[PDB]
Each structure stands twice: as structure tokens, then as C-alpha cells.
Write a protein that binds this ligand. Structure first.
Ligand SMILES: NC(=O)c1ccc[n+]([C@@H]2O[C@H](COP(=O)([O-])OP(=O)(O)OC[C@H]3O[C@@H](n4cnc5c(N)ncnc54)[C@H](O)[C@@H]3O)[C@@H](O)[C@H]2O)c1
Ligand SMILES: [K+]
Ligand SMILES: [K+]
Ligand SMILES: [K+]
Ligand SMILES: [K+]
Ligand SMILES: [K+]
Ligand SMILES: [K+]
Ligand SMILES: [K+]
Ligand SMILES: [K+]
Ligand SMILES: [K+]
Ligand SMILES: [K+]
Ligand SMILES: [K+]
Ligand SMILES: [Mg+2]
Ligand SMILES: [Mg+2]
Ligand SMILES: [Mg+2]
Ligand SMILES: [Mg+2]
Ligand SMILES: [Mg+2]
Ligand SMILES: [Mg+2]
Ligand SMILES: [Mg+2]
Ligand SMILES: [Mg+2]
Ligand SMILES: [Mg+2]
Ligand SMILES: [Mg+2]
Ligand SMILES: [Mg+2]
Ligand SMILES: [Mg+2]
Ligand SMILES: [Mg+2]
Ligand SMILES: [Mg+2]
Ligand SMILES: [Mg+2]
Ligand SMILES: [Mg+2]
Ligand SMILES: [Mg+2]
Ligand SMILES: [Mg+2]
Ligand SMILES: [Mg+2]
Ligand SMILES: [Mg+2]
Ligand SMILES: [Mg+2]
Ligand SMILES: [Mg+2]
Ligand SMILES: [Mg+2]
Ligand SMILES: [Mg+2]
Ligand SMILES: [Mg+2]
Ligand SMILES: [Mg+2]
Ligand SMILES: [Mg+2]
Lengths: 108, 43, 215, 168, 51, 110
RNA sequence: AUAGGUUUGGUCCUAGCCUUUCUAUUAGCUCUUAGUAAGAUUACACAUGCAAGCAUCCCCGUUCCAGUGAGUUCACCCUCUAAAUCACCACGAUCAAAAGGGACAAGCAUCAAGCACGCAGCAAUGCAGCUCAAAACGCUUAGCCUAGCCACACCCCCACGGGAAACAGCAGUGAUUAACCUUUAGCAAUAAACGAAAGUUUAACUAAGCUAUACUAACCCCAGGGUUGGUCAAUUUCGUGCCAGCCACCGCGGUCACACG
RNA sequence: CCCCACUAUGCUUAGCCCUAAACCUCAACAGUUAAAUCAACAAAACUGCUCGCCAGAACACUACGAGCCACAGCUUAAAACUCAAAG
RNA sequence: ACAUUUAACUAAAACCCCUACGCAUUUAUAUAGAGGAGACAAGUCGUAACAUGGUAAGUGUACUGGAAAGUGCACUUGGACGAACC
């Protein structure tokens, strides 16, 4: 662009930063609604344990439960954090192990 | 000075805005005589 | 930039100022005192402990003038606090008196007069302060001449005082630096400064007034 | 690279190299110049190179430029008193035009030096406070003075925690 | 004093302008004379053609 | 002499003469672009009291600040018409000029 | 940026994403000492105690300090000139309102027209103008330009009057949020209020209590957390067998897994 | 897709509609062939100046708003979720 | 809408209005129902595209068809035409 054009347009308008699933917050509290499993996309194959929670903001989202073995049930309280599950398309929340009703994975 | 199309909505709104102004101007003057009449009566 | 008008802010302001002029409390209400608890019932505030004695024993200015033909015009009125402090005669020569008609005994109001503090008569009459205090005393007519008898003492007072240590050293250095050779001592002319006593009558015209909020 | 011919003109270094600081009387400067003709080359060079330097040093002076209105280039200065100073610039180089206006309407080097010295007095070395304004923030920075408790802990006898313990 | 000096400089420059303008007219007049001669020949030759 | 009007002397181009005894003048100032460090014209409109209604659109004028604003927007007065539209007299020589050509030669009056 | 990884069977170009650096909050796990600094998520609701008196009565002060960030170009310069300080009439200085002029956030033009927004005249009244793509008019977001400043003070912008009964003063509590300090002491220092003053008062402040949030200095005892395929410093042997699980990016696991436990 | 028949339509007059791979995908004006010419291919590489336009893929020649003789239309033209590529 | 009073040998007293807000005006959230877009290891029908892709492909527009798509008219090469004569 010419100098007149650059003066007339001004500085670049920073494209607004998008708030992810946590809405710019480190963690959110949630209530478990149902627990199910999801099959990953190619080239992976597994039954990844997920749950649907109602977040404190009122939105309902699917959250991956990490670790081997969980005891989560409906109406239980869990803390969720960011971090997408690269296998599961659209699962952008992860349950925190060791907080509220979600306990630490049991050793071996 | 400006090169902008006068579409129907603009043309119609501009007609009313002029009409409203004209009808208000006449009202400003009918609140001039009434005030003058009352002042004359006090004397 | 066009500020949005605040009409209610101006309406209330005018209403308040008006009510402050129509519902203003009188001197009878403001300066009342309960002689048992020694508290002003208007505000329920205790008087200072040092005033309790005189409040019970001494009379207010218009407790004395209410018993005179014309509220004691051209009459000398002193104060106990003055008699105890100063030997020289301190008194007001009353010129005008606005009594408070709302008092059942006409024992409140205002008063103007000419001040004569320590035998020095002021040239003009001004409003008298502390009219509500329990401190005033009326000068009997037959005692006026003797009471006002005063001989002006010699005014001999200190005219010049030395500068403090540091300032003195700095004025002497400027002299030598500029080249002026002199051995005279710098001294402050304190003749202009007329130090008046702390209990000198102040200007009542510039004094404020208690607000209307009654208890 | 930087856009345009002679990109040096769009640098703070070049814009601060102007030596013409008008006296406070100068309010408006109208530059009438011709776009063609050999006799007006200096005026064209003066508009190209020097107006940015003049404006940078005199932000509150209005500079307005008019093209091809008269047969010859000229400058006109409008002073606050109402006087108008016409400077004919035909046949002069851009350097000569610049030196001519410094002499007749520019503050001398002495006047400028004085203003800079008055600014020096605004910052006092002895004053303590934030680094934006003062050299040192606290007396504890001065060597010999009691250091800051954050760096060197104070003796127990000087600390209020134990001052009132010894007494009671 | 500086304003008087500026006016003197403007007057000196004006005296130089008048000298330059006088020379330019002399050259203009010469070029005009040649153009008029050429034009007159063209008109005459063209007028003869149409006659 | 003191005036409450900020702009004391300003040159501008007359752009409107439809108000009675008031010339609408466009005034342009050079403003530095902080990023590009290039000067671009910034224009502002000023109403200037013209008692004689002698201003024409397109002429350059000099506006002196009034001691106090005579109207809501009229804070200046027409001090002088620097260049009349189409009738410019060369300040250097004092001769009438159309563009870059002299209408009357400077050598007519020597 | 001194850059790095990643498109493909492969190469080059372009390009987004991510890695490495530095801070702040929250979570998991873990945690010895001392000094210092800092310290509700919420303009939601608040039990209790305290936070403004002084003083020979009048006055003065409680309009400050302290708090909060809801709203939001009221903050800056110039002009002019109140109140205030300089004991007092001065004086001018200092300080600083109202008024006048100028200047001053972000995103959206799928907000493009606003609809009286101008001028002249002593007035009567006349003229029809004024702003705007060089962004008017609007909507949305946000305290700011931090020796500090601006705004607010339960709500109705205001507060005569209404809803109604107020901690966005200190300590503390309920609810709420990922977010979680004591219902300490003293007016000794400084500051403020008052007094002519000796002085009195102050949840300002000072000195303590609590907390790895940070800095600094220690420790004879006492170390944990993460990671170990490549980017990127660093794995032996087993179990599991596209299962269980892992991954910031590229990816790993289908019976010899340096990638899972 | 091949063969045959026959409409709207291709034509004229009078009004609309306003689109194209409307692309020679190479902007207007002025100038140069000097040097490192220059990623690749294509139609060699550049300078001055100005206007217009473009900032990962997809969603999307779409939704909504607005304008238009257009009413299954045209012009202007996003976002949410998704991906680590697309080219 | 709303009135100039009482008092005057020092001087003061008196002074106090009513009109709005409505289920109207503005911006959203929730949806009977109706549809898109994207994603998604191994479903069904055909084979439209990539080779002259087996009718070269595509653009605009029109009509037609389960579906990709077919056809008309003009336009594009981001196809080719085998590159002396025969
Ligand atoms: N909008 C105006 O009426 C207007 C007036 C003066 C100058 N301009 C100039 O037009 C250019 C385009 O401005 P923009 O980006 O705001 O317009 P744009 O292209 O975004 O269009 C907005 C409006 O401006 C008009 N416009 C567009 N191009 C114009 C042009 N060259 N001249 C005049 N009007 C034009 C259009 O008709 C439309 O009504 C700029 O250079 C601007 O200085 C526009
Ligand atoms: K697989
Ligand atoms: K796999
Ligand atoms: K890259
Ligand atoms: K931690
Ligand atoms: K007091
Ligand atoms: K705020
Ligand atoms: K408020
Ligand atoms: K103290
Ligand atoms: K083409
Ligand atoms: K086909
Ligand atoms: K093809
Ligand atoms: Mg992860
Ligand atoms: Mg004053
Ligand atoms: Mg102000
Ligand atoms: Mg535009
Ligand atoms: Mg829209
Ligand atoms: Mg806010
Ligand atoms: Mg509250
Ligand atoms: Mg309020
Ligand atoms: Mg509190
Ligand atoms: Mg915290
Ligand atoms: Mg502490
Ligand atoms: Mg094994
Ligand atoms: Mg491992
Ligand atoms: Mg036919
Ligand atoms: Mg064509
Ligand atoms: Mg094109
Ligand atoms: Mg063009
Ligand atoms: Mg189309
Ligand atoms: Mg469309
Ligand atoms: Mg629509
Ligand atoms: Mg539905
Ligand atoms: Mg096929
Ligand atoms: Mg085919
Ligand atoms: Mg086709
Ligand atoms: Mg088609
Ligand atoms: Mg068919
Ligand atoms: Mg091809």
C-alpha cells in the first residue's frame, strides 16, 4: 500500500481474541449429567471415557475424563480445565483428577 | 458535497423532518402572541 | 461534550436554601441549656467542663438588657472573663440590640456596640459576639465614671529583634559577596506586628451559625 | 525498504535537525511555490525537504502551501502583531531560504540555550521519589545510611516487634 | 532592523527580476517576428490555393 | 487585546457564503503521523464574521480572532482577503496575474 | 528472535498452527527458618463492635482521610474570575471552581445519513441554514495518560420527593466464584480536626497476626514436582496387545512399545 | 451421450434485469535495460507516482441487515462450531 | 399554575404549587415447528471429476432429473489437435 493509504487505514485492527471453552478462565466447576464413551477419529481406535457436565456458566459441554478408571456418576461435582483431547474432535474440556468428587487414579 | 443515493426511506424521512420543522416553527409563533396578549392585560 | 442537564439537582438546591430561611431555628431554640444536665436540648451536646461553673452562676447579655428601658442603649456591659483576666477596663458601649421575640423572657438575640478593650476605644461600632454566653455583667450607672477611669501606660516596647542564628549568617554573607562592607547587625522590625491577646473580641459578622437540625 | 523517495525525511533524526525555531510572534507561514520552472527549484526543494523540519520544531505555527498561484515563489509570515513579512525566494536555493528565515524570524542560539537551562532546574538531584522523576527512591540507597529492611534485616532492638517486648 | 533588512533584500531581488524580464522580452519579440513571418507565408500560400 | 479564542491568526479557504454576514472557512494544518512520520493536512471549519459580505467561495482569507465569540460558532472575523478567487495580485511585484502568467507586465510601470 | 517443529512419495515457494523466553492468577502434588513487599471472584446481601470530635457555651470540624471501579472523553492547556491561605483594610502572590476557546479511549460503516442539529438584528423579526465517508448520528466494550487523577457513595444519572432501611470505613459473616488474611494493639512517630495553649480525638496511620503470591538471606538436621520418540536436556526390564491409555505440535499402542502402566 | 419431430429462446420495436473463466486472471500515468537478471512455472527484470484490493483452510457467490423496476434475483457481506493444514 | 404584603423613637417580620410509567419504547434469551453447516475406521445407490476419465473441463444464465449431474446459448483455456512437404 502507499503511504497515503497506510495513513488513511491506520494501524492494523487486531482481530478480536476468541474465548475458548472456559471463557478465558483457568477452571470451571460442573455437575455431571451423564457418562459415556467416544470413539476417536482415524487412525486411532479406543473407547475414551467422557462425560457431559453443566458448567457453572450454565452451558453444557462434553469433558474428557483422563486416567485409567473413574467413578464419576450423575449429580456429582467436578472441576474442569482446558486442553483439547487431540483424538476426540470437539472435546475441549478435561476433568481435573483429585478435586471434588473426581479422585486420583488408583495406583496400578 | 456528498455523493450518496437518496433511497425511498431517506427521501420519505427527509420530507417529514422538513414538515415537522415547519409545523414547529408555526407553534413557536403561536406561543409568542399568547404571551404578548397576557402581558398587555396586566397593564 | 454537551452535558445532560440535571434539573432535580437544582430544584432541591433551591428548595433546601429556601427551607433553611423559613424553618431557621431561633436563638431561643439554638442556645437553650438544661441547667441540671448542662446540655443544649436542641443538639443534645454537653458543654465543656470548664464552662459548667459560669453557666450556672453568670447571666447572658440579653438576660440583663431585657430589664432596661431601651435594652440598655448607651450602657456599658462588661464580662466576668475579662474582669478576672485584664486590669484595664474592657467593655462594650451598646448601640443597637435586636431582641429575639420568640423567647418567653426576651433573654436571647443580638447586640451591637463600640469595643473598648484595655482602655483603647475602637473608632466604629460592630456586632458583639458571645451574646449567648453566661459571662456578661452590667455596669451600674453610678459606677460608670470610676469603672472607665484609665491612665494610658507608656507604650515603650521592643522595636527590633535579632535574626535567628542561620538567617543572620546568610544575610551577612550576601553583604560581603556584593562588596558592601558594614558591621551593622541585621534585625527584624517587630514594631509593625501588633500582637493582640488571644481573648480579644473577634468579628461576629464573619462568624457562622448552627444549622436547623433539631433533636 | 522504507517507502518513497528520500525516506530519510521520515525519521526522527532528520526531523530534529531543523535549526529554525520561530519567535513566538510567528503564527502562520504561507508558502507559495511553482511546480515547474528552473527559477523555482529552490522553493520546490525547500517544500520537499525543509517544511517537515520547520513544522516539527514549530508545531503550533500553521503552514499552508499554495501551488501555481503566482508567477514567482514567495514566503509570507503572519505575526501576532498583524505585521506581514514577505520573503521572495525566487532564484534562492533551499539552503539559502532556510538560513534567511532563521536570521529574520528564528530564535538565536543563546535564547535556545537559556530555555534548556530552565528545564534543567525542574529536576532536583537531592529530591527522592519514583524513578520517572528522581534519581533515588529512598535514603536507604545512599551508602552509609541504614539499609532497607528488605535487603539487610534490622537489629531486633530497632524493630517494633521486640521494642515493646523488652519494655513489656 | 531585521524587517528593514528583509525589505532591502526583496528590493534587490526585484531589481534583478526586472533585468531578467527585459532580456526575455527581447528574445520573445525575436521569436514572435519569426513566427509571424512563417505564419504570413503559410496564410499567403494557403490563400493562393483556395483562390 | 486578550482574547478567549484559542486560534488567534489563521489562513483558510472560503467554502460557503450562504449565512448572512458569515463566511464558512476551511483551515488546514499539517499534522505529523506518528507511525509514518509524514505530515498530512488536517482541515477544520471556522465561521468568520464578514460585515460587508465581500467573501467569495474559493478565495483565501485571513481570520483574526474576535475578543469574545459573537455567536455559538463565530469566534473569528475576516481580517483580510489574501487571494481573491480569479483576481490575484502578485505580492512580489504587485501586478495582476492569472496563474503563473502576468496579466500586466512588471515592466509596464518600470 | 540467532530461531525451531509441522503440508508432500520427494523438492521449492507461500502460509497458518505450535515449540523455545518472561510475568500474573487458579488447580494437583509437595513444603524448614528469617526479613520485606503484596494480598475477596462479585457496585450481591450483611449479625455484632468500632471508625469525629474539639472547646469556657459561640463557632470550627464531621465536605477531609479511608473505600470502590458501577458509570464514563467532567482529568490537560489557554482566557477569565469566585471561594480559600498570607493576623487584619490592603496589596499582589499562592491555590483553584463556575463560565468561554482548544485538545483528549477502543471495536463496528451490515450504525450512512443526523433531523433543528445555523446565522443576522438593540429588538421586532428576517434568512434557511448547520454537522457528516478527512466518519456526523448511533451501538458495543472499558476507569484513566498512575508522585497520581477521574467517577461513584443502596437504587430512581440528580434526590424536593419516592422504593425503602443501605460495611464499595476497619475486623468479620452469608451467598456466590477456579479465586477464601485477624471479629489484634496503640495514638509513641507522621498526618488530619479542634484549642491562645498545656493537650484531646482518629480502624488515617504506626507496630503486630494470617498466606510459598513475590523478593532477599539462610539451613548441623531435613526434597520435592515435572520430564526422559523428535522439536528438547535425559530409560533398563516387565505387563498390556489399536485394548487399557498417552500427546504443546508431529504422533504412539494391531504380541519383541526407548511414546501407555 | 446417437437419430427424428417440435416449443420457449436466438430476430424487430418499446421497457426491464445488471451477471460471466466480463481473464490478455498481468491497474492508470512516467521512465529504464544498468546490476545480484531471476524461488518455480508462465508472457525477462525493474524504478517513480497514485488509486483499488489482499492477510491460513473451510463455513461462504452463505445467514442477517440495507439498497435496487430486480420478488426462485442482484450488490454489499459476517459469525459460532471444526481443522493443521489448504494452496 | 403562582403574589407584594406588614413594618419602619435602634430595626426587622412574612415567603414553602401541581403534572409521568404504560404490557407503552429498546435490546436480547428461551421455542411448537422448519432448515443449514461441519465433523464422524470399515452402511446404501450410481460413477460426476482427475488420462482426450472414456460426451475435454469450467464460467454466467436458463430449463430438466433419485443423486452426483444433463442439455441449450454465449464466453474461458486453468484441454488437445500429433507442429517442412505428402
Ligand atoms: N462519501 C462521499 O460522499 C465522499 C465525499 C468526498 C470525498 N470522498 C472520497 O471518496 C473516496 C472514498 O471514500 P470512502 O472509502 O468513504 O467511500 P466508499 O467507497 O466506502 O463509499 C462510501 C460512500 O462514498 C461514496 N464514494 C465512493 N468513492 C467515492 C469517491 N471516489 N468520491 C466520492 N464519493 C465516493 C459512495 O458513493 C458511497 O456513498 C475517498 O478518497 C474520499 O476522500 C467521498
Ligand atoms: K489404526
Ligand atoms: K493409531
Ligand atoms: K512455518
Ligand atoms: K501451586
Ligand atoms: K471548637
Ligand atoms: K470503572
Ligand atoms: K449514581
Ligand atoms: K499521634
Ligand atoms: K482468459
Ligand atoms: K461430464
Ligand atoms: K478435463
Ligand atoms: Mg493434554
Ligand atoms: Mg479572593
Ligand atoms: Mg473548569
Ligand atoms: Mg467504505
Ligand atoms: Mg449482519
Ligand atoms: Mg465497567
Ligand atoms: Mg453495599
Ligand atoms: Mg446517588
Ligand atoms: Mg469490610
Ligand atoms: Mg488469591
Ligand atoms: Mg503487616
Ligand atoms: Mg512387551
Ligand atoms: Mg512411560
Ligand atoms: Mg420459435
Ligand atoms: Mg471477453
Ligand atoms: Mg479480474
Ligand atoms: Mg485506476
Ligand atoms: Mg454469481
Ligand atoms: Mg446472496
Ligand atoms: Mg436478505
Ligand atoms: Mg424445534
Ligand atoms: Mg466419469
Ligand atoms: Mg467427462
Ligand atoms: Mg458445459
Ligand atoms: Mg452451470
Ligand atoms: Mg435433458
Ligand atoms: Mg491441464
Amino acid at each position: 500500500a502507499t503511504l497515503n493509504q497506510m495513513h488513511r487505514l491506520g494501524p492494523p485492527k487486531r482481530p478480536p481474541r476468541k474465548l475458548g471453552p472456559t471463557e478465558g478462565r483457568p477452571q470451571l466447576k460442573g455437575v455431571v449429567l451423564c457418562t459415556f464413551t467416544r470413539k476417536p477419529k482415524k487412525p486411532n481406535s479406543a473407547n475414551r471415557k467422557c462425560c457431559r457436565v453443566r458448567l457453572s456458566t450454565g452451558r453444557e459441554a462434553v469433558c474428557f475424563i483422563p486416567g485409567e478408571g473413574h467413578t464419576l456418576q450423575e449429580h456429582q461435582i467436578v472441576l474442569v480445565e482446558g486442553g483439547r483431547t487431540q483424538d476426540l474432535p470437539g472435546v475441549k474440556l478435561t476433568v481435573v483428577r483429585g478435586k471434588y468428587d473426581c479422585g486420583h487414579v488408583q495406583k496400578k | 458535497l456528498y455523493y450518496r443515493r437518496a433511497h425511498r426511506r431517506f427521501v420519505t424521512k427527509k420530507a417529514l423532518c422538513i414538515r415537522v420543522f415547519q409545523e414547529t416553527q408555526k407553534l413557536k409563533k403561536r406561543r409568542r402572541a399568547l404571551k404578548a396578549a397576557a402581558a398587555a392585560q396586566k397593564q | 461534550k454537551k452535558v445532560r442537564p440535571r434539573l432535580i439537582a437544582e430544584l432541591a438546591r433551591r428548595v433546601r436554601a429556601l427551607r433553611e430561611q423559613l424553618n431557621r431555628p431561633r436563638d431561643s431554640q439554638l442556645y437553650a441549656v438544661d441547667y441540671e444536665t448542662l446540655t443544649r436540648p436542641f443538639s443534645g451536646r454537653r458543654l465543656p467542663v470548664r464552662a459548667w461553673a459560669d453557666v450556672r452562676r453568670e447571666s447572658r447579655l440579653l438576660q440583663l438588657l431585657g430589664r432596661l428601658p431601651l435594652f440598655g442603649l448607651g450602657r456599658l456591659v462588661t464580662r466576668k472573663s475579662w474582669l478576672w483576666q485584664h486590669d484595664e477596663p474592657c467593655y462594650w458601649r451598646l448601640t443597637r440590640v435586636r431582641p429575639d421575640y420568640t423567647a418567653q423572657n426576651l433573654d436571647h438575640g443580638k447586640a451591637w456596640g463600640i469595643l473598648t478593650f484595655k482602655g483603647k476605644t475602637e473608632s466604629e461600632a460592630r456586632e458583639i459576639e458571645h451574646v449567648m454566653y453566661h459571662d456578661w455583667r452590667l455596669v451600674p450607672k453610678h459606677e460608670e465614671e470610676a469603672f472607665t477611669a484609665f491612665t494610658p501606660a507608656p507604650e515603650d516596647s521592643l522595636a527590633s529583634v535579632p535574626y535567628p542564628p542561620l538567617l543572620r549568617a546568610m544575610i551577612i554573607a550576601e553583604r560581603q559577596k556584593n562588596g558592601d562592607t558594614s558591621t551593622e547587625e541585621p534585625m527584624l522590625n517587630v514594631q509593625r506586628i501588633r500582637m493582640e491577646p488571644w481573648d480579644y473580641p473577634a468579628k461576629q459578622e464573619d462568624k457562622g451559625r448552627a444549622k436547623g437540625t433539631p433533636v | 525498504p522504507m517507502k518513497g523517495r528520500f525516506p530519510i525525511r521520515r525519521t526522527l533524526q532528520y526531523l530534529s535537525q531543523g535549526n529554525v525555531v520561530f519567535k513566538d510572534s510567528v503564527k502562520v507561514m504561507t508558502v507559495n511555490y511553482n511546480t515547474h520552472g528552473e527559477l523555482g527549484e529552490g522553493a520546490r526543494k525547500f517544500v520537499f525537504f525543509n517544511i517537515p523540519q520547520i513544522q516539527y520544531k514549530n508545531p503550533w505555527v500553521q503552514i499552508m502551501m499554495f501551488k501555481n498561484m503566482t508567477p514567482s515563489p514567495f514566503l509570507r509570515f503572519y505575526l501576532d502583531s498583524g505585521e506581514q513579512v514577505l520573503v521572495d525566494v525566487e532564484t534562492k536555493s533551499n539552503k539559502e531560504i532556510m538560513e534567511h528565515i532563521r536570521k529574520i524570524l528564528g530564535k538565536n542560539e543563546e535564547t535556545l540555550r537559556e530555555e534548556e537551562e530552565e528545564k534543567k532546574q525542574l529536576s532536583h538531584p537531592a529530591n527522592f521519589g519514583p524513578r520517572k522523576y528522581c534519581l533515588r527512591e529512598c535514603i536507604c540507597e545512599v551508602e552509609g545510611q541504614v539499609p532497607c529492611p528488605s535487603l539487610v534485616p534490622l537489629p531486633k532492638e530497632m524493630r517494633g516487634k521486640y521494642k515493646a517486648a523488652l519494655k513489656a | 532592523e531585521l524587517m528593514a533588512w528583509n525589505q532591502a533584500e526583496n528590493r534587490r531581488l526585484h531589481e534583478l527580476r526586472i533585468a531578467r524580464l527585459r532580456q526575455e522580452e527581447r528574445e520573445q519579440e525575436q521569436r514572435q517576428a519569426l513566427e509571424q513571418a512563417r505564419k504570413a507565408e503559410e496564410v499567403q500560400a494557403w490563400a493562393q490555393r483556395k483562390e | 487585546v486578550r482574547s478567549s479564542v484559542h486560534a488567534r491568526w489563521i489562513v483558510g479557504k472560503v467554502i460557503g457564503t450562504k449565512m448572512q454576514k458569515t463566511a464558512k472557512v476551511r483551515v488546514t494544518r499539517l499534522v505529523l503521523d506518528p507511525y509514518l512520520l509524514k505530515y498530512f493536512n488536517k482541515r477544520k471549519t471556522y465561521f468568520a464574521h464578514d460585515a460587508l459580505q465581500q467573501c467569495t467561495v474559493g478565495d483565501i482569507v485571513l481570520l483574526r480572532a474576535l475578543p469574545v465569540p459573537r455567536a455559538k460558532h463565530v469566534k473569528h472575523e475576516l481580517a483580510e482577503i489574501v487571494f481573491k478567487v480569479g483576481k490575484v495580485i502578485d505580492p512580489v511585484t504587485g501586478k495582476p496575474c492569472a496563474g503563473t502568467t502576468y496579466l500586466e507586465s512588471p515592466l509596464s510601470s518600470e
